[PDB]
Amino acid sequence: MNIFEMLRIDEGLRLKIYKDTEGYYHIGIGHLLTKSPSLNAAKSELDKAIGRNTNGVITKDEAEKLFNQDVDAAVRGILRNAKLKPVYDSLDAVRRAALINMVFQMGETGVAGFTNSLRMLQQKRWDEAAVNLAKSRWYNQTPNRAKRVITTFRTGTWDAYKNL
C-alpha cells in the first residue's frame, strides 16, 4: 500500500466537476478547483490547469496528471514548512503517509495548526495524539476518513485501509 493508493481510496475519482463535502468545486482525485460559488470560475480554473477547453470534463490520464502534481506539492509543502518538517522527519514511513494525507486534504496551513497533536506525534505518544486529533472540526465533518488516518498514526500499519 502507498500514499497514492491511500489517497485514491480517501478521495475517489470523478471525471466531471463536483462539490466535495464543503460544497467547493473539485475534479479528479480530490483536486480543489476553486473556493468560490462560480461554476464558471471553476470551469475557468479547470481549463487553465489542463491547458485546453475541457467543458468541465477531463480524461483519466488528465486526472492522474493533476494527482501526481498534487502529491508532489503536498510533500514539498511539508518540507518547506517550519512547523511540519521536524514532525515528518521524526516519523516512520507509514506515519509520514498519514501526515501527507492531512496536508493534501486541508492544506499545510490547516495542519500546522494541530499544534498539540503535532507535539504528541513528535514524542511518539500514539494513543494521546489520536484522542487529541479527534477533538476537531475535521473529525466531526468527515469522521470515516478522519478515523482511517487517525488509526494510521496510532498503529503505524495500513490496517485501516485493507479491504477498501
Curated annotation (Swiss-Prot):
Changing E11 to A/F/H/M/N: Complete loss of enzymatic activity. Changing E11Q: Complete loss of activity. Optimum pH is 7.3. CDD domains: T4-like_lys. Its main location: host cell. Changing G30F: Almost complete loss of enzymatic activity. The enzyme is destabilized by 1.5 kcal/mol. It is found in: Host cytoplasm. It comes from the Viruses. Keywords: Antimicrobial, Bacteriolytic enzyme, Cytolysis, Glycosidase, Host cell lysis by virus, Host cytoplasm, Hydrolase, Viral release from host cell. The active site is at E11 (proton donor/acceptor), D20 (proton donor/acceptor). Changing N132I: 5-fold decrease in enzymatic activity. Changing S117F: 10-fold decrease in enzymatic activity. This is Endolysin. It comes from Enterobacteria phage T4. The gene is E.
